[PDB]
Design a protein around this nucleic acid. Sequence first.
RNA 1: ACCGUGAGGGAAAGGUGAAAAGAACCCCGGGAGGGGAGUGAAAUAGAGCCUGAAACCGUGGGCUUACAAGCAGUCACGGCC
RNA 2: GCGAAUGCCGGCAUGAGUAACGAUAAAGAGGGUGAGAAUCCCUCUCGCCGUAAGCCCAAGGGUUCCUACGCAAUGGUCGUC
RNA 3: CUCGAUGUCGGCUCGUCGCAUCCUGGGGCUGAAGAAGGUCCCAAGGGUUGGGCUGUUCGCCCAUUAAAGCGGCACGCGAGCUGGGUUCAGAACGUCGUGAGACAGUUCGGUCUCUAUCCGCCACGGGCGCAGGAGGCUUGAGGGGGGCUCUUCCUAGUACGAGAGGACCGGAAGGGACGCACCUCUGGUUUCCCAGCUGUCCCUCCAGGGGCAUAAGCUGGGUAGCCAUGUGCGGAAGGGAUAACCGCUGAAAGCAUCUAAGCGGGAAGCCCGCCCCAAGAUGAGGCCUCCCACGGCGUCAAGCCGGUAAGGACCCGGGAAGACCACCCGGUGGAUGGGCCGGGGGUGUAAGCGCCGCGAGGCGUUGAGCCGACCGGUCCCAAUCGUCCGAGGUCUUGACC
Lengths: 117, 122, 117, 206, 57
Amino acid sequence: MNRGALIKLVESRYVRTDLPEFRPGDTVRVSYKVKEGNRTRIQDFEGIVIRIRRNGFNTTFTVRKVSYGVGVERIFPLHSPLIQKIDIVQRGRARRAKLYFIRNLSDREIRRKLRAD
Amino acid sequence: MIQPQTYLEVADNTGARKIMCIRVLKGSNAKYATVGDVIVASVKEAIPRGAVKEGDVVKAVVVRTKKEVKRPDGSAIRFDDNAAVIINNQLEPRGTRVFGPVARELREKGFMKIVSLAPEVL
Amino acid sequence: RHLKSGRKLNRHSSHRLALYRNQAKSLLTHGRITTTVPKAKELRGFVDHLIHLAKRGDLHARRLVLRDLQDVKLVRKLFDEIAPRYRDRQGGYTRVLKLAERRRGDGAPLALVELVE
Amino acid sequence: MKGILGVKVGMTRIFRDDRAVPVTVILAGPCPVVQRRTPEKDGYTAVQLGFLPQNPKRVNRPLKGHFAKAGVEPVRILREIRDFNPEGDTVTVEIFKPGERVDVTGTSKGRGFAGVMKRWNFAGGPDSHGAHKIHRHPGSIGNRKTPGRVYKGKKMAGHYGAERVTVMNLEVVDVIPEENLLLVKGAVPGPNGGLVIVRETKKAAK
Amino acid sequence: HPVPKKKTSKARRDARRSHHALTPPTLVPCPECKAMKPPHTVCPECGYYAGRKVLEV
RNA sequence: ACCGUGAGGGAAAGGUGAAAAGAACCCCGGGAGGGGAGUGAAAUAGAGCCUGAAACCGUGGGCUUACAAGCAGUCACGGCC
RNA sequence: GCGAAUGCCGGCAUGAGUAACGAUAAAGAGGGUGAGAAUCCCUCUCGCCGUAAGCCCAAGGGUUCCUACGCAAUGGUCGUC
RNA sequence: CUCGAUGUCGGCUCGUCGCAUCCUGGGGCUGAAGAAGGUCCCAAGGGUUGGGCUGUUCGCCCAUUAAAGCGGCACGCGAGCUGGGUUCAGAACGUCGUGAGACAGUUCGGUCUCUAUCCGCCACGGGCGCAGGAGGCUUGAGGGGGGCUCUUCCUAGUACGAGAGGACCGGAAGGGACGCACCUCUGGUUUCCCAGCUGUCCCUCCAGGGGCAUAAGCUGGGUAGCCAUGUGCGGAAGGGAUAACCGCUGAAAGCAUCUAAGCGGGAAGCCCGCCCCAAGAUGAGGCCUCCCACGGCGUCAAGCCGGUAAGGACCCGGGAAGACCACCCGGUGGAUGGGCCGGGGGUGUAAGCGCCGCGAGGCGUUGAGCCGACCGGUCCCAAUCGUCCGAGGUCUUGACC
């Protein structure tokens, strides 16, 4: 019973699936739109593209910093169910080894290297 | 994420996108040039011409790297540390500047100009 | 800091694994062996999992625990010698039990523990 | 205004248009195990239990203390004053309405025995120009002829975990009437999967 | 460096040695033969509960 | 003896008994050592063993002691024995 | 004829059954011999040396080395080593 | 007193009281319009930042700040550090000295020990007791913890107004610092969780592994626990006495006065309200339930024995509780551990054979493989058997039946 049980439950309650979207993939830079908004309920299907970085897993989870070269390096981290989300579509490839936090990217990247993977 | 003494980045009418702040402009007990805050500093880095100089202003907090945790559980981090220089009132320094969007900023609000100003990729 | 603690042991992880094994081995040899209180306790947990693969019974499994004990004689010795004998119960193939006395000089409480027939 | 509970675990949730985090309160439902009538204990109040751990295991006394107004077969019990029992059995399946403010407490997870380091704030001493004590150690303790000795009540090393305590206001967030559970966004006062209680006081004028 | 002052008499010495004191050894009889057995144990005789597997040689 | 390189410094320990008759032998024990038999005038004269006290630690008994602040004590008195 | 002189010589106390065992180069098993074996013997797992924890000549030590019995003293407890 | 011995500076760390109170408020006063100052009496509540240079505390300076106080305790702190210091020999010169040597002129280095006995503080236990023997729930006299402050805005830009400018009263939101808990989330760890790697001796050559490369050789990530830099919360109300200071009713001073008389106003302070201890408060225990008056002896038989599992202790086995200990749940009529199993979350597609390349390896079966503390199943194993201690119920008075 206990924890596992009851809790599993309440969450199931609220989050339900984070909106069946189960497209994780390690690599894949990809793109989405979160409601993220302010100013006159300007909740905007805002879409950021980002090279897939990491994640938290259980009730509460999060599609991690996918780093995005904006013109400086900006990495974007976002909670998974987090009703906050609407569109979440992949573009990139779910490839590469050593598993996540492979910031190798954000760090010494270098477009070339980037592609080097 | 924060700092007192600091080698920070900017990109306004900068002498150089870099100045060292003393501390936080908030509630007398600084300890955090924190995201979206306002604080104190002088230049560290050079400045071709430019009316900027090797002085000291105060201004407002951009980027950080160690958790931009927002109200909506919006989350982010840029491998960059920088804010925009202020002229008194706050009224920003330069005509433009190299950087972009995201809540925290506008949210602090007082600086809409910065707001519309740094938009696109970079 | 410390309190809520799992897998509880002494000496030094290398020393330990060292023992766990050496012992797991010697017991495998004699069915029953004599040492000190937890020597047994934990040794149970361990030689324990080993017999578990002993049972596992297959080219791979074999490959593994061998990975750990290093040496055919026993390798097979267990894997086929008794692994069958057990393959059918629900683990706990260990019988850890408190002898009559305590080694000298100190009074270290000891016992015999073995494959539980 | 009081709930008796088996504190579950802490977890995150969402509200309005934003996530935030809560905690899992669970309580079958204590019952009038003992009443201090006032003429009884002019410190008038209600004592209750809220579960049941094995019956084959149970002192006679317990058996009949229960006998009293007779109720069930548990062991979790305690008391609180100035709280009527407009019932003779309580659950919370409503007992505790959400969108309300609460106060609550519980057992306090059990620390260890760490000095100036733990126990109190300020992490020890310093480290380098001095290492015949490297980084931290005990502050100072009194003096020559001031009191002429060693003081009597400043913080002190050691055991500072096996105790109990509570938290002031917190939010009632949500009510799950079935599995007698409630999410409250709380300082998980003390462990979890263990013991706690809630009470509500706050004539607080903002 | 900090050698006391004297010794509050055997008196004290005791006070201490005293709260100290030496208790005795737990035991019941062999679940099998007789003599003293501490809780879970066997010995140079009976030696069991299900298979002496012990004593005599 | 023993410290110092050498020069050199430089302890301690006297007695069992009257005479050896100073301990066959039996018994717990690896042994020591421990109970007996014999010694004898004694062996609380038993081998470091005459006389063998103070100090300190011990086994039993008497009185005494858990709301107590005093070198000590001690004058008084009351309860124990 | 003596408290008394941080006295002189010899006992006997005290913190203390806490500080400490001389290197963080680890050891675990099985059987053996024994009055008793963590601490001896074989044998089996295992770590640390190896450029030394190698061997070698020499110095200086001067018993001991061996083989056989024994352990009350001695090893910083063990201990049939 | 001290020379049979008392460590002197500066700083550190933990500070503790004090008011001639700095910020706080309460105030009468103004040369007080407002605002803002400034002028005294009351009141320590909390609070009473960073750096710079200087061995200097003082100080001067940078930036803020509500504010960035004076000082008591051998100028608190060496049995708790630090030790630049001035103050053992050096050597330096600058300076005296006929020179030996010297200068509170200076400058470079310059061997600070500490196994706690006492009373004292921090904790945790063993007693023995608060005259039945018991399992458990309480109420607190009395003691402990925290009581700070900024800015935005409504009222409200009207009270003041020439104007520039800003108000009692009272009401919202955000924050700094700090105190209390706590991991979901955020990030930190994770000596074995997983994964990659060189060198090397070993297994059996090949792969597939193995110890050593620290007590993990190295690397990249990594639960769970613990933990900030992450999260909730808190410093309130509000009740009663009052400080300065304001008044009511009123004489003695046949007009007057707050003034002994009698009444009220009033401070972020005092008692409470807030949490945390607590009858070893011998002045409790209050309530609940429950076992009943056993045997034999000189009597106030308040001494000796089995006694009730009434209950508990012991041993075992388990614990975010934990040095030991006590606390806590359990012992097989159980799930308590470990085991196993299902599952989470970890690693990042194994081992082999198979498919393209002389080869390096590449692709397939593979997001496989292997896994420690996290939810929970199932007696696979080990919580067997036992033991011991633990009421009979003082005298006395009053009351009821």
